[PDB]
């Protein structure tokens, strides 16, 4: 309703580096926000893509970044008469990007790694990996728990049971409250998809550079499977958490699958140690239900609620033709110990091929009337295609079924305007939460700023 | 916290067989390698082997092929070393190792079995 | 195999002495080294590990140093504790492979 599409803000990076195409608030030790920005396609030392990571003071003029440097060499381990070794080329560092206290936590989900045993390999894989950075003290850290050193031989054998090779880890990123990080990997056990979670703090004080295989200990991942319904179900493609059970001492897990069971796409919530509490079903197979999930209160009942998107859906027109135009799903959480029901809103695209959906991002309350609102993505929606982020308004029943405002990309075509999407946040602190957009395409990044009602 | 209790001191004759264990305290066997070394006053520390319990794959020093057998047995959180033909040779203490962070790495020990074979 | 000479087999050092222990490998191991402390009458407790990180709960006044084929431990500052017996373990090849052995005596 009240972001300012008027006087906007926007950040840029290198030409080609996807910049935006991740991004998320930071807050350092002292409160002061800036915006943290992934681009996956930024070259390295080598004239070579594989990624970088930006840090953006908040400036009403925006521009250029300074870079959060992480290291880009390729690493080499001879030990226990083993070669142990990481590929960084192309590997996308900032493909998702989450900020936790004063930490930043950056990821590189085809970051590929291969261990050499005489003639035999583990066979160079995406594995991922997490690089961690604390940017005020400069300490550096990183997270990869898909690495393993077993040969492709004793995986055929066992029929490619706890097959971690293509994990790609980060795919998908989100940190508890209590510091935990939660990374989906969409391509763990052969493409089933898994998560893995660790403390942060943990992970700092368990890393060591030059390693490669180190243990976690009070690490958690969650477990493969012999049914055919989680087969390329691609676990993990996205995350979230909230609270779902009633305890308020647990953390629940939102993780989306949008290829599972033969591409009916599903999201469920879990508990902590991954068990699994609800299955949401997609409506229409190869809609992409669980593209995206978020997590927010919409109607002020304490409870947090549960948005799905699904970029892909085809609704149904005029003379039996479908059109692919995207829909979002709305499941608010009963009072109690109960199952969530069916949708209690569907918001529905209208530009064709639009991708409604694709995005969805918690806004907090933006006008402040006591509900907290949302913002969805239809990347290459609007009349010209170039892209629009519509507005949802929390009540007491849910959300308007009407959007309170539209932003119209100010991006030529092909920028993936709000591809990627953050708020909830008063950047600029004048009390009220705003909103970031990304775009890709354009290797920028737009900043919305929330003004009092009018 | 992490601890490696193993079994009381063996008091066995040559050409018989005897089985030590290891069992972890405080974390669960699967999480790393397991190894297990062998000292003597003069001979000092050597490599027996080590074993994955998350799957039972064994490595060994050629030395050892035939009398060590390394197995584990996660429902009770335990690994275990079998000697076998024992010998006066054999008569040495012997630890259970694992790894802190580093995979490969020799930090945990137990507190150590001793052997005495004797007629 | 590769042998891991240590040395010197013994010393003769008094309370606040700052001495080395050195390892010799028969080949480059690449800080792939970790080093063993043994109290007299008692099990073993690790020092560092990968040559230069030390073991969570170790003093500071302990370190590691070297590369190649040639590694250091060092220890600042001797506390009545620090008599005892050092050993070194490369595992930069299969089978791990022990150093002699180091013990720390008192002196008068």
């Known amino acids: 309703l009240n972001l300012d599409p008027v006087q906007l803000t926007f950040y840029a990076g290198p030409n080609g580096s996807q910049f935006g195409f991740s991004l998320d608030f930071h807050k350092d030790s002292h409160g002061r926000v800036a915006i943290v920005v992934g681009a996956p396609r930024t070259l390295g030392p080598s004239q070579e893509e594989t990624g970088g990571v930006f840090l953006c003071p908040w400036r009403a003029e925006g521009g250029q970044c300074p870079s959060l440097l992480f290291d880009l060499r390729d690493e080499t381990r001879n030990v226990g008469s083993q070669t142990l070794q990481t590929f960084k080329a192309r590997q996308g560092l900032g493909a998702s990007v989450v900020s936790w206290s004063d930490v930043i936590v950056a990821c590189a989900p085809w970051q590929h790694w291969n261990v050499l045993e005489k003639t035999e390999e583990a066979e160079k894989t995406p594995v991922g990996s997490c690089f961690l950075a604390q940017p005020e003290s400069g300490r550096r850290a990183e997270y990869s728990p898909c690495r393993g050193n077993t040969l492709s031989r004793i995986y055929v054998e066992n029929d490619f049971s706890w097959d971690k090779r293509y994990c790609e880890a980060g795919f998908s990123s989100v940190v508890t409250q209590a510091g935990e990080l939660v990374l989906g990997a969409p391509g763990g056990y052969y493409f089933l998809g898994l998560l893995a979670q660790a403390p942060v703090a943990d992970i700092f004080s368990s890393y060591r550079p030059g390693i490669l295989l180190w243990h976690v200990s009070s690490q958690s991942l969650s477990f493969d499977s012999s049914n055919p319904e989680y087969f390329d179900g691609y676990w993990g493609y996205s995350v979230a958490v909230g609270e779902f059970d009633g305890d308020l001492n647990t953390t629940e897990y939102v993780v989306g699958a949008p290829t599972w069971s033969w591409t009916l796409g599903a999201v469920e919530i879990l508990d902590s140690y991954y068990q699994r509490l609800h299955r949401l079903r997609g409506e229409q197979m190869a809609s992409y239900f669980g593209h995206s999930v978020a997590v927010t209160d919409v109607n002020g009942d304490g409870r947090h609620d549960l948005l799905v998107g699904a970029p892909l859906y085809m609704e149904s027109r005029a003379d039996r033709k479908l059109a692919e135009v995207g829909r979002v799903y709305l499941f608010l959480q009963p009072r109690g110990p109960h199952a969530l029901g069916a949708p209690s809103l569907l918001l529905t695209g209208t530009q064709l091929y639009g991708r409604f959906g694709s995005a969805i991002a918690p806004l907090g309350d933006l006008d402040r009337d006591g509900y907290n609102d949302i913002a969805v993505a239809a990347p290459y929606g609007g009349p010209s295609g170039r892209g629009q982020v519509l507005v949802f308004l929390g009540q007491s029943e849910g959300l308007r079924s009407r959007p309170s405002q539209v932003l119209d990309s100010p991006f030529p075509t092909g920028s993936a305007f709000g591809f990627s999407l953050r708020g909830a946040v008063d950047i600029d602190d004048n009390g009220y939460p705003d909103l970031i957009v990304g775009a890709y395409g354009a290797n920028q990044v737009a900043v919305y700023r929330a003004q009092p009602v009018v | 916290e992490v601890q490696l209790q193993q079994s009381g001191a063996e008091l066995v004759k040559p050409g018989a067989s005897v089985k030590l264990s290891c069992t972890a305290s405080?974390?669960?066997?699967?999480?790393?390698?397991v190894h297990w070394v062998k000292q003597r006053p003069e001979q000092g520390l050597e490599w027996i082997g080590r074993?994955?319990?998350?799957?039972?794959?064994?490595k060994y020093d050629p030395k050892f092929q035939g009398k060590a057998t390394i197995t584990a047995d996660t429902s009770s959180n335990t690994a275990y070393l079998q000697l076998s033909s024992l010998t006066s040779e054999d008569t040495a203490v012997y630890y259970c190792?694992?790894?802190?962070?580093?995979?490969?790495?020799?930090?945990?020990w137990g507190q150590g079995t001793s052997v005495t074979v004797s007629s | 195999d590769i042998l891991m000479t240590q040395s010197p087999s013994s010393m003769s050092v008094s309370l606040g002495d700052t001495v080395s222990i050195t390892c010799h490998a028969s080949?480059?191991?690449?800080?792939?080294i970790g080093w063993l402390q043994q109290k007299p009458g008692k099990s073993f407790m690790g020092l560092i590990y990968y040559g230069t990180n030390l073991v969570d709960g170790v003093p500071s006044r302990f370190s590691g140093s070297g590369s190649g084929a040639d590694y250091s431990l060092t220890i600042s500052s001797l506390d009545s504790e620090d008599f005892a017996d050092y050993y070194c373990?490369?595992?930069?090849?299969?089978?791990?492979?022990f150093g002699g052995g180091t013990k720390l005596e008192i002196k008068r």
């Open positions: 190792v694992r790894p802190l962070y580093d995979y490969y790495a020799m930090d945990y």
């Open positions: 074993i994955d319990p998350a799957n039972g794959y064994t």
């Open positions: 405080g974390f669960n066997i699967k999480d790393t390698y």
């Open positions: 080949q480059g191991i690449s800080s792939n």
């Open positions: 373990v490369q595992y930069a090849q299969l089978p791990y492979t």
